[PDB]
Amino acid sequence: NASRNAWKASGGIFDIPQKETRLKELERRLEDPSLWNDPEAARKVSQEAARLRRTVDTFRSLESDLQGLLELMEELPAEEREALKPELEEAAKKLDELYHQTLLNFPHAEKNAILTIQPGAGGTEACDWAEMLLRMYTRFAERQGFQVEVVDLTPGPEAGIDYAQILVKGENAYGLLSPEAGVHRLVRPSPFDASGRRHTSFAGVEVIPEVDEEVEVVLKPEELRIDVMRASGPGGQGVNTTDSAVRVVHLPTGITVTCQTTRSQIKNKELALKILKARLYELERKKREEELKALRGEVRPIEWGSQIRSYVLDKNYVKDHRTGLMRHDPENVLDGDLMDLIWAGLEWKAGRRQGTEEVEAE
RNA sequence: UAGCGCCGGCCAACUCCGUGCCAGCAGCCGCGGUAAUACGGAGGGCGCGAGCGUUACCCGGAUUCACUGGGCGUAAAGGG
RNA sequence: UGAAACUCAAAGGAAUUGACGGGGGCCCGCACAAGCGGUGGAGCAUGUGGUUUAAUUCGAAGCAACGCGAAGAACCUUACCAGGCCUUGACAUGCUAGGGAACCCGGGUGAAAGCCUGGGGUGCCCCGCGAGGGGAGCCCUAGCACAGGUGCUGCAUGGCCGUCGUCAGCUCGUGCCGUGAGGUGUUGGGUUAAGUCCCGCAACGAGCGCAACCCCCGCCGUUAGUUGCCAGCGGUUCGGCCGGGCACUCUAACGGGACUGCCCGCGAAAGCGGGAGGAAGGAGGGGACGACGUCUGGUCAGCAUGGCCCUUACGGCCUGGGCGACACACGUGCUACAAUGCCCACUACAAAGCGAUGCCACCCGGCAACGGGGAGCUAAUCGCAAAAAGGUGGGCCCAGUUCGGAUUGGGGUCUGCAACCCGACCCCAUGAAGCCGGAAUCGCUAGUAAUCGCGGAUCAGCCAUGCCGCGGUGAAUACGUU
RNA sequence: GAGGGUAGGGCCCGUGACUGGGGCGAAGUCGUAACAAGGUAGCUGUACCGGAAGGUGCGGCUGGA
RNA sequence: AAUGUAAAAA
RNA sequence: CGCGGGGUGGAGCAGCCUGGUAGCUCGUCGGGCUCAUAACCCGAAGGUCGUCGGUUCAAAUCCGGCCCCCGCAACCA
RNA sequence: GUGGUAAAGGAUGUGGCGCCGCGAAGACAGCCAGGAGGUUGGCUUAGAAGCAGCCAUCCUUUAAAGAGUGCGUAAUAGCU
Ligand SMILES: [Mg+2]
Ligand SMILES: [Mg+2]
Ligand SMILES: [Mg+2]
Ligand SMILES: [Mg+2]
Ligand SMILES: [Mg+2]
Ligand SMILES: [Mg+2]
Ligand SMILES: [Mg+2]
Ligand SMILES: [Mg+2]
Ligand SMILES: [Mg+2]
Ligand SMILES: [Mg+2]
Ligand SMILES: [Mg+2]
Ligand SMILES: [Mg+2]
Ligand SMILES: [Mg+2]
Ligand SMILES: [Mg+2]
Ligand SMILES: [Mg+2]
Ligand SMILES: [Mg+2]
Ligand SMILES: [Mg+2]
Ligand SMILES: [Mg+2]
Ligand SMILES: [Mg+2]
Ligand SMILES: [Mg+2]
Ligand SMILES: [Mg+2]
Ligand SMILES: [Mg+2]
Ligand SMILES: [Mg+2]
Ligand SMILES: [Mg+2]
Ligand SMILES: [Mg+2]
Ligand SMILES: [Mg+2]
Ligand SMILES: [Mg+2]
Ligand SMILES: [Mg+2]
Ligand SMILES: [Mg+2]
Ligand SMILES: [Mg+2]
Ligand SMILES: [Mg+2]
Ligand SMILES: [Mg+2]
Ligand SMILES: [Mg+2]
Ligand SMILES: [Mg+2]
Ligand SMILES: [Mg+2]
Ligand SMILES: [Mg+2]
Ligand SMILES: [Mg+2]
Ligand SMILES: [Mg+2]
Ligand SMILES: [Mg+2]
Ligand SMILES: [Mg+2]
Ligand SMILES: [Mg+2]
Ligand SMILES: [Mg+2]
Ligand SMILES: [Mg+2]
Ligand SMILES: [Mg+2]
Ligand SMILES: [Mg+2]
Ligand SMILES: [Mg+2]
Ligand SMILES: [Mg+2]
Ligand SMILES: [Mg+2]
Ligand SMILES: [Mg+2]
Ligand SMILES: [Mg+2]
Ligand SMILES: [Mg+2]
Ligand SMILES: [Mg+2]
Ligand SMILES: [Mg+2]
Ligand SMILES: [Mg+2]
Ligand SMILES: [Mg+2]
Ligand SMILES: [Mg+2]
Ligand SMILES: [Mg+2]
Ligand SMILES: [Mg+2]
Ligand SMILES: [Mg+2]
Ligand SMILES: [Mg+2]
Ligand SMILES: [Mg+2]
Ligand SMILES: [Mg+2]
Ligand SMILES: [Mg+2]
Ligand SMILES: [Mg+2]
Ligand SMILES: [Mg+2]
Ligand SMILES: [Mg+2]
Ligand SMILES: [Mg+2]
Ligand SMILES: [Mg+2]
Ligand SMILES: [Mg+2]
Ligand SMILES: [Mg+2]
Ligand SMILES: [Mg+2]
Ligand SMILES: [Mg+2]
Ligand SMILES: [Mg+2]
Ligand SMILES: [Mg+2]
Ligand SMILES: [Mg+2]
Ligand SMILES: [Mg+2]
Ligand SMILES: [Mg+2]
Ligand SMILES: [Mg+2]
Ligand SMILES: [Mg+2]
Ligand SMILES: [Mg+2]
Ligand SMILES: [Mg+2]
Ligand SMILES: [Mg+2]
Ligand SMILES: [Mg+2]
Ligand SMILES: [Mg+2]
Ligand SMILES: [Mg+2]
Ligand SMILES: [Mg+2]
Ligand SMILES: [Mg+2]
Ligand SMILES: [Mg+2]
Ligand SMILES: [Mg+2]
Ligand SMILES: [Mg+2]
Ligand SMILES: [Mg+2]
Ligand SMILES: [Mg+2]
Ligand SMILES: [Mg+2]
Ligand SMILES: [Mg+2]
Ligand SMILES: [Mg+2]
Ligand SMILES: [Mg+2]
Ligand SMILES: [Mg+2]
Ligand SMILES: [Mg+2]
Ligand SMILES: [Mg+2]
Ligand SMILES: [Mg+2]
Ligand SMILES: [Mg+2]
Ligand SMILES: [Mg+2]
Ligand SMILES: [Mg+2]
Ligand SMILES: [Mg+2]
Ligand SMILES: [Mg+2]
Ligand SMILES: [Mg+2]
Ligand SMILES: [Mg+2]
Ligand SMILES: [Mg+2]
Ligand SMILES: [Mg+2]
Ligand SMILES: [Mg+2]
Ligand SMILES: [Mg+2]
Ligand SMILES: [Mg+2]
Ligand SMILES: [Mg+2]
Ligand SMILES: [Mg+2]
Ligand SMILES: [Mg+2]
Ligand SMILES: [Mg+2]
Ligand SMILES: [Mg+2]
Ligand SMILES: [Mg+2]
Ligand SMILES: [Mg+2]
Ligand SMILES: [Mg+2]
Ligand SMILES: [Mg+2]
Ligand SMILES: [Mg+2]
Ligand SMILES: [Mg+2]
Ligand SMILES: [Mg+2]
Ligand SMILES: [Mg+2]
Ligand SMILES: [Mg+2]
Ligand SMILES: [Mg+2]
Ligand SMILES: [Mg+2]
Ligand SMILES: [Mg+2]
Ligand SMILES: [Mg+2]
Ligand SMILES: [Mg+2]
Ligand SMILES: [Mg+2]
Ligand SMILES: [Mg+2]
Ligand SMILES: [Mg+2]
Ligand SMILES: [Mg+2]
Ligand SMILES: [Mg+2]
Ligand SMILES: [Mg+2]
Ligand SMILES: [Mg+2]
Ligand SMILES: [Mg+2]
Ligand SMILES: [Mg+2]
Ligand SMILES: [Mg+2]
Ligand SMILES: [Mg+2]
Ligand SMILES: [Mg+2]
Ligand SMILES: [Mg+2]
Ligand SMILES: [Mg+2]
Ligand SMILES: [Mg+2]
Ligand SMILES: [Mg+2]
Ligand SMILES: [Mg+2]
Ligand SMILES: [Mg+2]
Ligand SMILES: [Mg+2]
Ligand SMILES: [Mg+2]
Ligand SMILES: [Mg+2]
Ligand SMILES: [Mg+2]
Ligand SMILES: [Mg+2]
Ligand SMILES: [Mg+2]
Ligand SMILES: [Mg+2]
Ligand SMILES: [Mg+2]
Ligand SMILES: [Mg+2]
Ligand SMILES: [Mg+2]
Ligand SMILES: [Mg+2]
Ligand SMILES: [Mg+2]
Ligand SMILES: [Mg+2]
Ligand SMILES: [Mg+2]
Ligand SMILES: [Mg+2]
Ligand SMILES: [Mg+2]
Ligand SMILES: [Mg+2]
Ligand SMILES: [Mg+2]
Ligand SMILES: [Mg+2]
Ligand SMILES: [Mg+2]
Ligand SMILES: [Mg+2]
Ligand SMILES: [Mg+2]
Ligand SMILES: [Mg+2]
Ligand SMILES: [Mg+2]
Ligand SMILES: [Mg+2]
Ligand SMILES: [Mg+2]
Ligand SMILES: [Mg+2]
Ligand SMILES: [Mg+2]
Ligand SMILES: [Mg+2]
C-alpha cells in the first residue's frame, strides 16, 4: 500500500505550494478595515480564507503520517513495527477523507445517475461489445453496493443490443460513473468473422442525474396580457356591438395566440389561454432539452476516430488514454474493477483538468 | 565557417531504443492496431556542399493527340 | 448535339489455376432407404452455460469443446480464496565474513507453520608432549551474484495431438506444348478398396501415398512335458491324490498353409462370374500404420522456448475454505416404468488380467459390512473367483405392484492424523417421479446391435454409472442411389 | 465631337428561401435485382406500374440452353 | 426456401 | 356548456345486449432445425378490464358520479 | 355641514359608566448619575460579541442594570 500513500501525498502536495502562496495574498488582504467596509468584497475574501481549512489539515496531518511511519516501519516481524502499523489504519480512514474531498465536488455527484450504452462503428460485432459493457457497468454497481434499475433495453439483429439505458440507484452514483462517458475501443478476433482476424469496434456511453418541472407557474396572471375587441366576419348587429375577440399575449416571451371562433368572450379567453399554455409549454420544454444539447456540448464526439480507453483482449491489456494508465486484466476490468481506476485516474484527471483550467484560464 | 536532403520499394544508404491505427508519414504502392530498416530520437551509412531541400509553372518521360509514331470483333472507339 | 465541378487508383479485355453452383455425367461411405435398439420425458450420476460467492483457479467452443487435460480434489492434490508466518529463499551454482563440527534429544509458545530456547556433543586436517589456534565438511546468521513465477502472449515458437480422412490423392526429372500464368505425364477405354492393374497415348520414367514386410484370431505339423490326462493299466482318505505316460488339451517359439493356383464361361489383357479341392478363398476376420497439405484448430497449465511483466513480493510455508455453491439451460451417462418380468433357493459353462507389510485359503464371532485367529503364495503350483445372463424348483398375478428404488430418519463398520463442509459400505425403517416420453435426434451391416457379467490402469479410501480391455448368450435388415 | 442623360435589348459573373439529382463516408434500416438455370436465363429500346431494388407487355440480342 | 459488416498474405 | 360512441395481458382487437367461465393475432420466455441469425416447428407464461360508489348471492358485463380518447353539434340576429 | 343617507379595517376626536394597578413612606412626564461583571450564554454560520436563524429560565458588586428593547458595524464599541 506504500504506493497509493505517496500518491495521495503527491495530490495533497501540489495543493500545498499553490494554495500556499494563494493564501498569503488573501490573508494580508483581510487585515485592512477598508477591505471590510466593502461588504460583498470581503465576503469572497473570507471565502478563500475559508478554503484554507481544507488546505491546512491535509498537508499537516498527512505530512506527519508519512515520516512517523517511515521510521518505525522499515524492518521487524513482531514487536514495535506491528505497533506502528495499526496507527496508520486510522490514517487509512484519513486517506478516506481525502478521497471524498476530491470526488464529492461535482454539480450532482451525490445523486443517482443514468447510464446509456449505444453501439457504433463495428457492425454486429460493435453491438456485441455494447452488451459486454452493459454487464460490465451493471456488475460494478452490484459490488459498489448499488441498485440497478434498467430503464430501457433493445437487443440487436444478431448479437443482442442496439441500445440500452440504466438507472444506478444509490449515492455518488453520478460522481462515480461521471468519468465514463465517451467512446471505448475494443480489439479482438471477431466472433463473427469467418477468418477471425483482429477487428476494432466502438461503443458509446453517457451519464446524467435527474430533475424537475415548471409548467403552470407561468400562467400566473401578472405575466400575460389579455385584450378584448370586436370579432370579425359574420355576426350581423351582434358581431358589430359585441366584442368577443380575445388575444392573450405572453409578455415574458412575446408569444401570442388570438381567438374569435365562438360568440362568447369568456369561452374564447378560455380557449386562447388553453392554447398559449401548450405553445409556451413546448418552448420551455425545448429549452430544457436545449440545455441537454449544451450537455451534448460538454462532450459529443463521433464514433471511432475518437476513444477514451482501449480494451484489447489479444495481448490482454486495457488502456485509459486520458491518463496513460494501463492494466493487463481486461477480464477483471470487464467485471467491476473500476474503483481504483475511476478513483485516481478518472477523478484526478477530470477534476484536475477542469480545476486547473478554472484557476488558470477560466 | 559546414551545412542540408535522404537511408521500406522505385532509389545509393541499416541497426538500436521509444512508440502503439495514437503520435505521426505520404510522390505513387502503402507504413503505425506492443516487439516498425516506412512515425520519432540515436549510432552508423548513402548523396551533394556555400549550399541542400520545398512549393509553383514549362518541355521530358508520354509512341498518353502517334507527321516522324497509335488505334476502333470482345479492352475506350464503325455512323442504324 | 453534349460538358464541368467534384471524386476514385483504378476501371477493364483475354486466358490460367482453384473454390463454389437451388449444372451435368460416372462413383463411393450405416449418407439416405430397409431394419434393431436408443437419447430428448422421469430419478440419479457426470461435464458445461448462467447466476451466486470471500473465493466458487485455469484451459477446451459446431462438426473436430461439453464422463474432454483429470488413469482417482476430504487435508495432499491445488494453480483460487481468508488468516498466521519466511522474505537470497523449498531446490542450483558461486564468492566472502564472523560463531559452531558433524549429529541427536527437548522444553515455553501457536491453529499449524513459524518464532523464543535448554541439553548431549566434540569426530576429520596442520603445529606442538600439552595448551592454544589454523584448515575441510556440515549448520546458524550477515552480504552479493542469483533463485522462484501454473504471471502474459499457442496470433512470436519446438514438441506432441485433433481434423478433413484410410479419402486416393499430392508431386518431381527430362522432353514437348503455350508470349505467359500454365499445360502434359496424372487425361482417355476397361479394372479394382485404391493414381489396383491392363490397354491406349507426347511423353518416358521416378518419388510421398495405396498394397505388401510387423502384431492378434481361424486349420495343421516341429521342439518343450510340474497344465491336462485312467485317453491306458494299478493302488484310491475315489480329488488326476500316488505310480505312471504326453498321446490329446493347453502353454509358447518356429514353421506349413491361399497364389484367382485348379475346373468351367466372358475378356485384347487386366479382370470378372460360377464350380472343386480346402480349416479357410477372390483383401478370410480384427489390429498397428494416417501422404502434399488444410483449419492464424489445440496446448506457453506436461515439458521446452523468443518477448514481456513481478521481485519482502505476481515468490514460499501452514491452518481453514473452495473447486462439491443452485431460481436455471444443454451435452455424455446410469437405473427404470415391470410378466420375453421381479423375488428366493439350488446347480452349471469363460476370457484376459492382476497379487508376497499385496492377493488373503479355512475357522471363529456378527443379520451384515467388518473384525479376531490363521495356512499358503515373488505366483500355468496358493490367492482375488461366486462370472453373469443361463438351467431346474418355489413364490407374486397386473397393481404404481414383491414394478421402480429416489428421498429422509435411525443405528453401525472400514481407510486415513481428520470423513461438518465432502468418502465408501451395511442393516432397519422410510418408500419419490416415473404406466415408454413434444418438436427433434444418436448408434450399428454379423459373432455386429442388443444384452450379461469379469478384469485392469489410477489409488489410503473413493464420490467409476467414467475409461481401457475380456469373455458369455446372440438378431434384424439392405428393392435401390431419386 | 469627349462625355453625360434617358429608354430598351444581348452575353457573362456573383448571390437566393427552397428544390433535383450526383460523389464520398470501417458502422444503420429495408429487402435481395445481378454474378451458378443466382433458384422466373440475362440484357436491351420502349410502355405501363410498384417503398426499393424491380416487375410485366411488345419486339430485339446472346454477351443463354 | 432470405442474409452474414468492419484489421490476415517477405 | 350539448348529444353519441369507447377505456380489456407489452401492441391492436374480441367478451358486455341476454351477469357465473377473460378469447384471437403479433410480441414475450423455454426448447429445437442452422455454421449462425431470420423464417419455420414444439411448450409455456402474461391481464387491478380508467378510478371512486352502488344493485346482486355474484359485476369486465347492470346503474350513478369523476377522469382520459374519438364522432357530431354550437344557428337568427 | 356629521345631520344631508358605503364596508372590512383603522386612530392620544369628544362625552359617559365600570374594573385593575401606582402615589404625600413623593407617583406619571421631563430631567442628572450608573445602567456592570464570568458573558464574548450554549448551538450553527465565512462571520453570528444582549442584539440573523435554532435552544433556552445562572449568580455576583448593588438601592440598581433583562442570559436582553431598538437602531447600528463585516463582526465591535457605541446611543437607548
Ligand atoms: Mg501526526
Ligand atoms: Mg521522533
Ligand atoms: Mg499479529
Ligand atoms: Mg495500533
Ligand atoms: Mg484521493
Ligand atoms: Mg422507475
Ligand atoms: Mg429490426
Ligand atoms: Mg440477441
Ligand atoms: Mg460475418
Ligand atoms: Mg469455425
Ligand atoms: Mg400571481
Ligand atoms: Mg370580414
Ligand atoms: Mg354569411
Ligand atoms: Mg347568416
Ligand atoms: Mg351585446
Ligand atoms: Mg356591449
Ligand atoms: Mg367568428
Ligand atoms: Mg364555433
Ligand atoms: Mg429563455
Ligand atoms: Mg466515423
Ligand atoms: Mg473474478
Ligand atoms: Mg535526396
Ligand atoms: Mg536518385
Ligand atoms: Mg538501397
Ligand atoms: Mg501517445
Ligand atoms: Mg508500451
Ligand atoms: Mg520496435
Ligand atoms: Mg506489428
Ligand atoms: Mg521513407
Ligand atoms: Mg527512422
Ligand atoms: Mg548520423
Ligand atoms: Mg561554388
Ligand atoms: Mg509533362
Ligand atoms: Mg504531357
Ligand atoms: Mg507527345
Ligand atoms: Mg493505342
Ligand atoms: Mg478499319
Ligand atoms: Mg471516355
Ligand atoms: Mg453509311
Ligand atoms: Mg449515312
Ligand atoms: Mg453503335
Ligand atoms: Mg442517327
Ligand atoms: Mg465524348
Ligand atoms: Mg470528360
Ligand atoms: Mg456548372
Ligand atoms: Mg471446403
Ligand atoms: Mg449414422
Ligand atoms: Mg462400416
Ligand atoms: Mg433409417
Ligand atoms: Mg428417452
Ligand atoms: Mg432426462
Ligand atoms: Mg454445453
Ligand atoms: Mg447472493
Ligand atoms: Mg491460461
Ligand atoms: Mg473456465
Ligand atoms: Mg476424473
Ligand atoms: Mg493468502
Ligand atoms: Mg542460499
Ligand atoms: Mg570476491
Ligand atoms: Mg520442540
Ligand atoms: Mg516440562
Ligand atoms: Mg580432514
Ligand atoms: Mg589430508
Ligand atoms: Mg594436508
Ligand atoms: Mg596428511
Ligand atoms: Mg598431527
Ligand atoms: Mg603433531
Ligand atoms: Mg608430535
Ligand atoms: Mg593430544
Ligand atoms: Mg581439505
Ligand atoms: Mg577442500
Ligand atoms: Mg495454434
Ligand atoms: Mg505448434
Ligand atoms: Mg482431398
Ligand atoms: Mg490432379
Ligand atoms: Mg495436373
Ligand atoms: Mg472416351
Ligand atoms: Mg501406384
Ligand atoms: Mg497340434
Ligand atoms: Mg483303468
Ligand atoms: Mg480299473
Ligand atoms: Mg478299454
Ligand atoms: Mg503327477
Ligand atoms: Mg507358397
Ligand atoms: Mg488367370
Ligand atoms: Mg465358390
Ligand atoms: Mg489379414
Ligand atoms: Mg484391416
Ligand atoms: Mg499399409
Ligand atoms: Mg496455427
Ligand atoms: Mg484458443
Ligand atoms: Mg503462458
Ligand atoms: Mg514463455
Ligand atoms: Mg521464458
Ligand atoms: Mg508486486
Ligand atoms: Mg514493489
Ligand atoms: Mg496371511
Ligand atoms: Mg477373509
Ligand atoms: Mg456367524
Ligand atoms: Mg473383512
Ligand atoms: Mg479379516
Ligand atoms: Mg497345478
Ligand atoms: Mg481390485
Ligand atoms: Mg433369471
Ligand atoms: Mg418359475
Ligand atoms: Mg406411486
Ligand atoms: Mg449398534
Ligand atoms: Mg404422468
Ligand atoms: Mg402396470
Ligand atoms: Mg468394471
Ligand atoms: Mg481403486
Ligand atoms: Mg465399468
Ligand atoms: Mg455621341
Ligand atoms: Mg453616347
Ligand atoms: Mg453612363
Ligand atoms: Mg421617358
Ligand atoms: Mg443594359
Ligand atoms: Mg442567377
Ligand atoms: Mg443542393
Ligand atoms: Mg438517377
Ligand atoms: Mg440520392
Ligand atoms: Mg441535395
Ligand atoms: Mg447511384
Ligand atoms: Mg452509409
Ligand atoms: Mg442502428
Ligand atoms: Mg445500405
Ligand atoms: Mg443490410
Ligand atoms: Mg438473387
Ligand atoms: Mg429470387
Ligand atoms: Mg444467368
Ligand atoms: Mg424490358
Ligand atoms: Mg409503401
Ligand atoms: Mg421477349
Ligand atoms: Mg434485327
Ligand atoms: Mg449472356
Ligand atoms: Mg441444357
Ligand atoms: Mg438485411
Ligand atoms: Mg449488415
Ligand atoms: Mg461480406
Ligand atoms: Mg372496443
Ligand atoms: Mg365509460
Ligand atoms: Mg378508448
Ligand atoms: Mg372491457
Ligand atoms: Mg391496450
Ligand atoms: Mg392499456
Ligand atoms: Mg399496460
Ligand atoms: Mg361497454
Ligand atoms: Mg406466439
Ligand atoms: Mg424463442
Ligand atoms: Mg428461438
Ligand atoms: Mg460463424
Ligand atoms: Mg449461438
Ligand atoms: Mg432461432
Ligand atoms: Mg426485420
Ligand atoms: Mg414440456
Ligand atoms: Mg406456440
Ligand atoms: Mg402462444
Ligand atoms: Mg396462450
Ligand atoms: Mg391464460
Ligand atoms: Mg368497467
Ligand atoms: Mg368475472
Ligand atoms: Mg361543426
Ligand atoms: Mg335573418
Ligand atoms: Mg334560418
Ligand atoms: Mg352631507
Ligand atoms: Mg366601523
Ligand atoms: Mg377601532
Ligand atoms: Mg388608549
Ligand atoms: Mg422609594
Ligand atoms: Mg452591557
Ligand atoms: Mg462569544
Ligand atoms: Mg461561537
Ligand atoms: Mg456588550
Ligand atoms: Mg448584528
Ligand atoms: Mg432551578
Ligand atoms: Mg464607526
Ligand atoms: Mg467577524
Ligand atoms: Mg453593548
* DSSP bridge partners of A248: A226, A257
Do strands A225-230 and A243-249 pair parallel, antiparallel, or not at all (unpaired)?
antiparallel
3-state helix, strand, coil in chain A (%, to 5): 50, 15, 35
3 state SS of A201? strand
Q: Is A249 left (phi over 0), alpha (psi -120 to 50) or beta?
A: beta
CA–centroid distance, A58 to ligand 23, in Å, is 67
Separation of CA A166 and C1' D6 in angstroms? 78
CA–centroid distance, A236 to ligand 164, in Å, is 13
Residue A181 · residue A91 · CB < 8 Å: no
Rg, chain A, Cα only: 30
A114 residue type, one letter: I
Query: For residues A126 and A104, what is the distance between their CA atoms, to the nearest angstrom?
Result: 34
3 state SS of A159? coil
- Residue A315 CB in 7 A reach of strand E: no
Nearest to A106 by CA among A357, A353, A347: A347
Query: For residues A315 and A188, what is the distance between their CA atoms, to the nearest angstrom?
Result: 9
Method: X-ray
Instruction: Give pairs for A63-69: CB < 8 Å, separation 24+.
Output: A65/A91, A65/A94, A66/A5, A66/A6, A66/A9
**Which residue is listed with cell 398559449?**
A276
Query: For residues A107 and A175, what is the distance between their CA atoms, to the nearest angstrom?
Result: 9
* DSSP bridge partners of A226: A248
- The grid cell for A108 is 450532482
- The grid cell for A51 is 478554503
Q: What are the φ and ψ backbone dihedral angles of A182, each rounded to 5 degrees?
A: 65, 180
Q: How many CB atoms lie within 10 A of CB A202?
A: 21
C1' nearest to CA of A315: which nucleotide? C153
Query: For residues A323 and A87, what is the distance between their CA atoms, to the nearest angstrom?
Result: 33
Nearest to A131 by CA among A153, A147, A112: A153
A29 residue type, one letter: R
Separation of CA A298 and C1' C276 in angstroms? 103
3 state SS of A113? strand
Query: For residues A173 and A181, what is the distance between their CA atoms, to the nearest angstrom?
Result: 14
Chain D nucleotides reached by a protein CB under 7 Å: 26-30
Give chain A residues 111-150 with Cβ within 7 A of strand E.
Answer: 121-126
Nearest to A338 by CA among A67, A194, A133: A133
3 state SS of A351? helix
Q: How many CB atoms lie within 10 A of CB A127?
A: 27
CA–centroid distance, A183 to ligand 89, in Å, is 62
Q: What are the φ and ψ backbone dihedral angles of A72, each rounded to 5 degrees?
A: -75, 20
Chain G nucleotides reached by a protein CB under 7 Å: 46-47, 73-75
Query: For residues A340 and A332, what is the distance between their CA atoms, to the nearest angstrom?
Result: 12
Residue A116 · residue A206 · CB < 8 Å: yes
Separation of CA A156 and C1' D49 in angstroms? 36
Residues whose CB is below 7 A of strand G: A 33, 36-37, 39, 42-43, 46-47, 49-50
CA–centroid distance, A129 to ligand 8, in Å, is 12
In degrees, to the nearest 5, what angle opens at C-alpha A144 toward C-alphas A142 and A148? Answer: 40
